Amino acid sequence: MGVQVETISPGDGRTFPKRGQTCVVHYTGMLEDGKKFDSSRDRNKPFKFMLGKQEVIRGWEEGVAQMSVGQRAKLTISPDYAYGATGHPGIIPPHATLVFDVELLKLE
């Protein structure tokens, strides 16, 4: 599959990221089994990226673009939209479906 977005708490339902905007998020990244491999929350600092610059996996570019400011959503991303057949040795295994818990805090 592509990226599935499932809402946890709604956003304003009106402010959606456009290409070139900086998204400011908190996120927790887990393998399909639930093992957490990354989290901005555990660093106590939100994460920023610019939409459309491929600073993040494809599933993020496509999934966060469907969120409104303030929304918290569960994104499920297939390996082709993620780290693929190769994965990331020692962190993400081959052919891994990834689940992300993402809150879109604001746009800059």
Short mmCIF file of C-alpha atoms in Angstrom, two decimals:
data_model
loop_
_atom_site.label_atom_id
_atom_site.label_comp_id
_atom_site.label_asym_id
_atom_site.label_seq_id
_atom_site.Cartn_x
_atom_site.Cartn_y
_atom_site.Cartn_z
CA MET A 1 0.00 0.00 0.00
CA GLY A 2 0.81 3.66 0.02
CA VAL A 3 0.32 5.65 3.15
CA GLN A 4 -2.74 5.18 5.35
CA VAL A 5 -3.67 8.14 7.56
CA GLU A 6 -5.91 7.47 10.57
CA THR A 7 -6.90 10.39 12.78
CA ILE A 8 -6.18 10.43 16.50
CA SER A 9 -7.31 14.00 17.29
CA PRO A 10 -8.50 16.47 14.65
CA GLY A 11 -6.70 19.63 13.63
CA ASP A 12 -8.28 22.89 12.64
CA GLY A 13 -9.50 21.16 9.47
CA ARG A 14 -8.49 24.18 7.41
CA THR A 15 -4.68 24.70 7.35
CA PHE A 16 -2.99 22.11 5.11
CA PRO A 17 0.73 22.14 4.22
CA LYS A 18 1.74 23.37 0.77
CA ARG A 19 4.97 22.57 -1.04
CA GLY A 20 7.85 24.67 0.26
CA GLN A 21 6.40 25.19 3.73
CA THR A 22 8.22 24.07 6.87
CA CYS A 23 6.24 21.52 8.87
CA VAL A 24 6.84 21.42 12.63
CA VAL A 25 5.95 18.05 14.15
CA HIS A 26 6.33 15.77 17.10
CA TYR A 27 6.55 12.13 16.07
CA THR A 28 7.12 8.60 17.31
CA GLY A 29 8.32 6.01 14.79
CA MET A 30 7.64 2.32 15.31
CA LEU A 31 8.05 -0.91 13.42
CA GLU A 32 4.86 -2.78 12.55
CA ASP A 33 5.29 -4.95 15.67
CA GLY A 34 5.26 -1.81 17.86
CA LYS A 35 8.97 -1.49 18.64
CA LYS A 36 9.88 2.20 18.79
CA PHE A 37 12.98 3.22 16.85
CA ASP A 38 12.78 7.03 16.86
CA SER A 39 10.92 9.82 18.65
CA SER A 40 11.20 13.60 18.81
CA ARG A 41 9.21 13.47 22.05
CA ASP A 42 12.04 11.56 23.74
CA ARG A 43 14.33 14.42 22.66
CA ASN A 44 11.91 17.10 23.96
CA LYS A 45 12.27 19.15 20.78
CA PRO A 46 9.94 19.13 17.75
CA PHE A 47 11.25 18.16 14.32
CA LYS A 48 11.16 20.49 11.28
CA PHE A 49 11.25 19.66 7.58
CA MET A 50 10.35 21.43 4.34
CA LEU A 51 7.56 19.80 2.35
CA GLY A 52 8.61 18.73 -1.15
CA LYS A 53 12.38 18.75 -0.55
CA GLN A 54 12.66 14.99 0.20
CA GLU A 55 14.23 15.61 3.61
CA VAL A 56 11.94 12.83 4.90
CA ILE A 57 10.68 9.47 3.61
CA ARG A 58 8.14 9.64 0.79
CA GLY A 59 5.36 8.42 3.09
CA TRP A 60 5.86 11.52 5.24
CA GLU A 61 5.70 13.92 2.28
CA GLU A 62 2.44 12.31 1.18
CA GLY A 63 0.96 11.68 4.64
CA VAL A 64 1.65 14.94 6.44
CA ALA A 65 0.33 16.85 3.41
CA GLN A 66 -3.12 15.38 4.20
CA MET A 67 -3.10 16.66 7.80
CA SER A 68 -4.40 19.96 9.10
CA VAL A 69 -2.53 22.05 11.66
CA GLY A 70 -3.14 20.65 15.13
CA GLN A 71 -4.05 17.15 13.95
CA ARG A 72 -2.53 14.04 15.49
CA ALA A 73 -2.60 11.05 13.15
CA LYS A 74 -1.34 7.50 12.83
CA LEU A 75 0.42 6.98 9.48
CA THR A 76 1.09 3.47 8.20
CA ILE A 77 3.75 3.43 5.48
CA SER A 78 4.82 0.53 3.25
CA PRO A 79 8.54 -0.13 2.61
CA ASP A 80 8.45 1.37 -0.90
CA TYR A 81 7.48 4.73 0.70
CA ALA A 82 10.00 4.21 3.51
CA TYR A 83 13.39 2.51 3.79
CA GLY A 84 12.56 -0.20 1.18
CA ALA A 85 14.23 -3.56 0.62
CA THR A 86 17.52 -2.35 2.08
CA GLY A 87 16.06 -0.80 5.26
CA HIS A 88 18.52 0.85 7.64
CA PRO A 89 20.91 -1.77 9.10
CA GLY A 90 20.71 -1.94 12.88
CA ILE A 91 17.60 0.28 13.06
CA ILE A 92 15.04 -0.57 10.34
CA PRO A 93 15.00 -4.14 8.94
CA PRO A 94 14.45 -5.00 5.27
CA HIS A 95 10.94 -4.67 3.84
CA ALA A 96 9.60 -2.93 6.95
CA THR A 97 6.14 -1.43 7.16
CA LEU A 98 6.47 1.62 9.40
CA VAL A 99 3.90 3.20 11.71
CA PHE A 100 4.25 6.84 12.79
CA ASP A 101 2.36 8.82 15.43
CA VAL A 102 2.58 12.42 14.20
CA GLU A 103 1.28 15.72 15.57
CA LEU A 104 1.42 18.70 13.20
CA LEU A 105 2.13 21.59 15.59
CA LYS A 106 2.42 24.50 13.12
CA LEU A 107 3.64 25.59 9.70
CA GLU A 108 6.43 28.08 9.04
#
